C-alpha cells in the first residue's frame, strides 16, 4: 500500500505549538525540539497549518508570499532543518496549500488593484490574477461562508473602483483560475516546497476554485479539471507525494474529489460527512445517521483513502447537514450563543463531550476503527479545552500545554505576552491538563491514546480493510466488521449513557469464535442462526477478532 | 429503621480538613464552613478522628484528656457551634473514643508512674489504672501489632521501676479494665460528649481491652462483657445513639462484637473481612474470595448493620488474610518496599488503583452495593494521592485539597507550615486534584460520587436488602441481588481489565425483565432455563432492577 494509507496524521500550528525563542510565538526551532514527543505518541505524518508570510487576518490562510516562512516562525533554514529532523525520525510532513485566494497584502493583489492598465498606458499583467466586476451582480445564487462577518462575496476596492470576488474574508481575494498564468503560479508554488522534500499538501478550499454564472459556484467540473492537473503534475514530477483535499460537501460530491482510475484527482479526502453525525448520534443515543451517511459514500478509487477526524482548527461545521440536524446540533452542543460561529460550533473535543473521558474514548475508538487514516488535532490527546473569549476560531487554537510551568511550557514569556493566551481555567488549565503530568499518570488520556494507536497499528485491517455494518437490533449500538488479508475484526460501540442490549446478526460467522483484541478474552462461539446477544455498559467499545 | 442503617458516613480528621485561622492546622470553625459541601456530596454522618488534647505521637489516638478539645482545633465553644451547625443541616456526627490506652502524658499515667504509694506516705490509687509487671514475662503468646516499631508489648518505666503493658506504642499505656474505676472513668468520658449532643462513637481497638494469661489477649469474653456495659449504658441513658466498633478480625470473631438480641454490644462493626478481598479480586480478575469471605459471616442481630469501606486513615491491613493472600497483595500493591507497614500497605485509594478512574468507580460501586452503610475516606471523592515522605501512616492523611491556590485552599499558611504538607506532585497535587475544579468539571469524580450516592439513596434495598450471590460462570464477573420491600436489585460487576462474557443463573426470575437503574432502559426478558448471557467491558458495573 501507499504510505498515506497506514499513516496517522497530526494537525498542529507552528505558531501555537512550542515557542523556541522566548517571544511568545511558536516557531520551527520549538517544533523541532518536540519531534520525539510526536514520534513516541505514534504519529506518522505532521500536517502543518499555513506557515507563510501573512498579516494573519485569517490566521495564515491569507498568504502574502507562497515561497517563504512567516517571520514569527523562524527562517527558511529553520524550516529546512526541521524537515531533516522530522524525516530522520520517520515522520512524513505535509503543508497546507491555499489555492483559492491570497491575502489582499499579496504583491499580486497590490499590483492588480491598480486597474486594467498601468499609468503609462500599458496593460497591467496582474489585474487578471483576480476576479473583477463592474457592479458585483454576477454569481448572485451563492452562499456566504463567513456569515457572521461578510454580507456579500463582492467588495468594492477603493483604488480600482471595481468589485472583486472573495468566498472568505474581504481581505482574501479569490484567484482567477480562468487565467492560465494563475494556474502556473500555483504549480510553481507547489514545486518550490516539494523540491525541498515536503511530502505533500493539504489543499485548502478546493470546491471554490472556478465560479460560473447559473451555478452554485461549488464542485464545478472545471475546478475538478484544475485539480486533475495538480495531481498529474506531482504524479509525473514528484511520485509518491500526497495530495489531501478539504472538501466539506455532501457525500455524492466529496467522492468526486478522488477523480477516477484513469483521471486521478486527490489521493485523500477528509470525511466531513461522518463527523457531525458522530456527535449527533451521541446526544441522540441513536447511530442510524452514521450508517445512513456512510451508506451514501460511493466506492473510491484504488489509491484513495478517507481521512477521518473528530475536530480540527475550524469550527465544528454544520454546513452540510439538514435544517433540522443543524438546529438539533446547536441546542445539543451550543447551549450558549457565543459558542456559534458561521453555521458551526467553535468548541474543542473534550468540552463538547462535557469532559467525559468515557465519551472521548468512545469517539476516538470509532475514529480509529472506521475506514481511512485518522488525524488527531493537537492537544486532544491530552484533553485540551477552548477559550471562547477569543474572536473567530482562535478559541480552539491556544498553545500546546506541555507542563505546569510558565505559560504551560509553551514559552518562557508570560501568558499575557503569548500570541494566544494559554488556557488557565480550573477545568482545562495547564495546571490540570498538561503533557508532563500525563507522562507520569499511569492512566492518563495521553497514555490511553498512545496505547490505543498501538493497538490499531498491530492490526492492518483498521487501515486497509473493507467495512460492513451489522444489524444489532438496537439503535444505540453500532456494529461493523473490518476484513483484510485473513483477519476479520468486529467492532461494537454503545452510544447510550446506560447499559444496552443488542442482537448482532452474525449469520456469516456461525462457527467463529470472537475473542478480544486486548488479551484474547473469549466470547461465546457463534451458533445456530447466528443472532448473537450482547450487553454493553455505557459508552463501551468492544474491539474483537473473529477467529476462524 | 434506625438512622445509622441508611446513613452514608464520611471519615475526616479535623486537623487536616480546613484551617480557619491561618496557623496551618485544621480547626472546628474551618470544618464548619465545609458542612454544606459534605451535605451536597450526599453524606449523613461525619466521623471525626480523635479531637482531644494529646502530644500526637500517634496523631491523636494517644489521648491526654478525654474531656477537652486539642488547642490546635479550637475550643469547646467552637466544637459546640460545629455540632449545632451540623445538626441544623441534618447531619449526624460521631466521635472516636479511645478506650484501650491513653497517652503516657495523660495525668492518670503521670500519677501512676510514681509507683504504688506516694512520697507523702499514702497509697496512689492511680497506680492500678494501668497494667504493670515486675519483670514483663506475662502474656507472652501475644503478637505485636506495630511490628515495625515495637519489639515487645512491655516497657520499663524508669520512675516506676516496673514494666507496663501496651498493645500499641510505648507512649500508649494500656488501661487496666480489671479495675472497675477505669470502666467508670470511660463511661463518664463517653457521657461527657453524649451530654453535649454527640450522636455516637467509633470505639478504637475494642478487641484488646482485657488481657489474660494463657490466651491471645484478643476477643476475650471479659472484654465482650465490658462492651455490653458500654451498650447497656447508652441504651438506658441515650436512646438512639450509635456505637461503632473497629475490630479487624476473622469473620467468626468479628460478628461477636454485635453481641446478641438479648445482650447487645455494638450497633455497627466495620467489615474488615471483605475490604482486602475487593483489591485481591481486581488484580486476580477472580471474585471467588469476595463470595467466600461474605459466606463466612453469620447473620447479625436485628439492630446490627455492617459498615463497608475501601480505605481509611490507616494502612490497608493484611493482618487477617492468609500467608498466600498476603504475599500476593504485597506483590500486587506494594511494588516499593517502603509502601509496607505493620502487615499492611500505606497508600491511598487512587494510587493503589494506578489512578485508573474506571477501577476507582468499580470498587466504589461495589462498596455502595454490598450490605451495609458505606463510609467514605475524606479526599477519595476527588482522588487524592499519598506522600510516602511522611513517617508512619501520615502519608494518607495529608490536608484536603479544596482549590488550586495557597496550600490547595486548606490554609493561607504556606505548604511547609501546614501540620502535614499538601501534596504537590504532577499527578495528585492540588494544582491537578482539588474540589473547586471538580465542582466545575461536569464529569468529575466528585460529581460521579455524588450522583452515585444519589442513585443508591433512591433504592433502599442497598441499605436494607438481603444479599444473594448468583453463579455467572466466569470468576471475573461478580453478581448478586438485593431484595427489600417489593424491590429486587441485580448488580453485576466485571473485575477484569478487558471484556468478559458470562452466563447468569436467573432461573428464579423467568418472565421478569432487568431494567437499568439509571435511565430505565430495559434489557431482554428472562426466558427458558433462565441462563442469561451477558457481555461486559473492562471494569463495567450494571446496576439493574428486576421487574414483576
Ligand atoms: Ca474561486
Ligand atoms: Ca488492654
Ligand atoms: Mg518564538
Ligand atoms: Mg487552624
Note down, in words, how this protein is organized.
- Two copies of one chain form a homodimer.
- In chain A, 26% of the residues lie in helices and 17% in strands.
- With 548 residues, the first copy, chain A, is of the alpha/beta class.
- Chain A has three domains: 3-99 and 180-457, TIM Barrel; 101-174, Oligo-1,6-glucosidase, Domain 2 (Oligo-1,6-glucosidase, domain 2), CATH 3.90.400.10; 466-547, Golgi alpha-mannosidase II (Immunoglobulin-like).
- In chain A, the strands form five sheets. An eight-stranded parallel barrel of chain A has the order 1-2-3-7-8-9-10-13.
- In chain A, helix 9 (274-284) packs antiparallel against helix 10, helix 9 crosses helix 11 (323-333) and helix 13 (357-369) packs parallel to helix 15.
- The longest helix of chain A is centred in the middle third of the chain and has 17 residues, at 221-237.
- Chain A is globular, with a radius of gyration of 24 Å.
- The two termini of chain A are 25 Å apart.
- The A-B interface holds A 354-357, 403-404, 425-427, 429, 431-432, 436-437, 440-443, 496-501, 516, 518-519, 521-524, 533-537, 540-542, 544 and B 354-357, 403-404, 425-427, 431-432, 434, 436-437, 440-444, 496-501, 516, 518-519, 521, 523-524, 533-537, 540-542, 544.
- One magnesium ion binds next to loops of chain B.
- It is classed as isomerase.
- The entry lists the keywords trehalose, isomerase.
- It forms a dimeric assembly.
Amino acid at each position: 500500500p501507499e504510505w498515506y494509507k497506514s499513516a496517522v496524521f497530526y494537525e498542529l500550528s507552528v505558531r501555537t505549538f512550542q515557542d523556541g525563542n522566548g517571544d511568545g510565538k511558536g516557531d520551527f526551532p520549538g517544533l523541532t525540539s518536540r519531534l520525539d514527543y510526536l514520534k513516541n505518541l505514534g504519529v506518522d505524518c505532521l500536517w502543518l497549518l499555513p506557515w507563510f508570510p501573512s498579516p494573519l487576518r485569517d490566521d495564515g490562510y491569507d498568504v502574502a508570499d507562497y515561497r517563504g516562512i512567516h517571520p514569527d516562525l523562524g527562517t527558511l533554514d529553520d524550516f529546512k532543518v526541521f524537515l531533516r529532523e522530522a524525516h530522520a525520525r520517520g515522520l512524513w510532513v505535509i503543508g497546507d496549500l491555499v489555492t483559492n485566494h491570497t491575502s489582499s497584502d499579496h504583491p499580486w493583489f497590490q499590483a492588480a488593484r491598480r486597474g486594467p492598465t498601468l499609468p503609462d498606458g500599458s496593460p497591467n499583467e496582474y489585474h487578471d490574477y483576480y476576479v473583477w466586476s463592474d457592479e458585483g451582480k454576477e454569481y448572485a445564487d451563492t452562499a456566504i461562508i463567513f456569515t457572521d462577518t461578510e454580507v456579500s462575496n463582492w467588495t468594492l476596492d477603493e483604488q480600482a473602483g471595481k468589485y472583486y470576488w472573495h468566498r472568505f474574508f474581504a481581505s482574501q481575494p479569490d484567484l482567477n483560475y480562468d487565467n492560465p498564468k494563475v494556474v502556473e503560479e500555483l504549480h510553481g508554488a507547489a514545486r518550490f516546497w516539494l523540491d525541498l522534500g515536503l511530502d505533500g499538501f493539504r489543499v485548502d478550499a478546493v470546491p471554490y476554485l472556478i465560479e460560473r454564472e447559473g451555478t452554485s459556484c461549488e464542485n464545478l467540473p472545471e475546478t475538478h479539471e484544475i485539480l486533475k492537473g495538480f495531481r498529474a503534475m506531482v504524479d509525473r514530477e514528484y511520485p509518491g507525494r500526497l495530495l489531501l483535499a478539504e472538501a466539506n460537501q455532501w457525500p455524492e460530491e466529496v467522492v468526486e474529489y478522488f477523480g477516477t482510475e484513469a483521471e486521478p484527482e486527490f489521493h485523500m479526502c477528509f470525511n466531513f460527512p461522518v463527523m457531525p453525525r458522530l456527535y449527533m448520534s451521541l446526544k441522540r443515543e441513536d447511530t442510524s445517521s452514521i450508517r445512513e451517511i456512510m451508506g451514501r459514500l460511493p466506492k473510491i478509487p484504488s489509491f484513495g483513502q478517507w481521512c477521518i477526524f473528530l475536530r480540527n482548527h475550524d469550527e465544528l461545521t454544520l454546513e452540510m447537514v439538514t435544517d433540522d440536524e443543524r438546529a438539533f446540533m446547536y441546542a445539543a452542543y451550543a447551549p450558549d450563543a457565543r459558542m456559534k460561529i458561521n453555521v458551526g460550533i467553535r468548541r474543542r473535543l473534550a468540552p463538547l463531550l462535557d469532559n467525559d473521558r468515557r465519551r472521548i474514548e468512545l469517539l476516538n475508538t470509532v475514529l480509529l476503527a472506521l475506514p481511512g487514516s485518522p488525524v488527531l488535532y493537537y492537544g486532544d490527546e491530552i484533553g485540551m479545552g477552548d477559550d471562547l473569549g477569543l474572536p473567530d476560531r482562535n478559541g480552539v487554537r491556544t498553545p500546546m500545554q506541555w507542563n505546569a510551568g510558565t505559560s504551560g511550557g509553551f514559552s518562557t514569556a508570560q501568558p499575557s505576552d503569548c500570541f494566544f493566551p494559554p488556557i488557565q481555567d480550573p477545568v482545562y488549565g495547564f495546571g490540570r491538563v498538561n503533557v508532563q503530568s500525563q507522562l507520569q499518570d499511569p492512566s492518563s488520556l495521553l497514555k490511553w491514546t498512545a496505547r490505543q494507536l498501538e493497538l490499531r497499528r498491530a492490526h492492518p485491517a483498521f487501515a486497509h480493510g473493507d467495512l460492513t455494518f451489522i444489524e444489532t437490533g438496537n439503535p444505540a449500538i453500532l456494529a461493523f466488521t473490518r476484513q483484510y488479508d485473513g483477519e476479520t475484526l468486529l467492532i461494537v460501540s454503545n452510544f447510550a449513557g446506560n447499559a444496552q442490549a443488542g442482537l448482532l446478526d452474525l449469520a456469516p460467522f456461525v462457527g467463529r469464535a470472537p475473542v478480544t483484541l486486548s488479551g484474547a478474552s473469549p466470547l461465546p462461539v457463534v451458533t445456530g442462526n447466528g443472532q448473537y446477544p450482547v450487553v454493553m455498559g455505557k459508552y463501551d467499545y468492544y474491539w474483537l477478532r473473529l477467529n476462524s
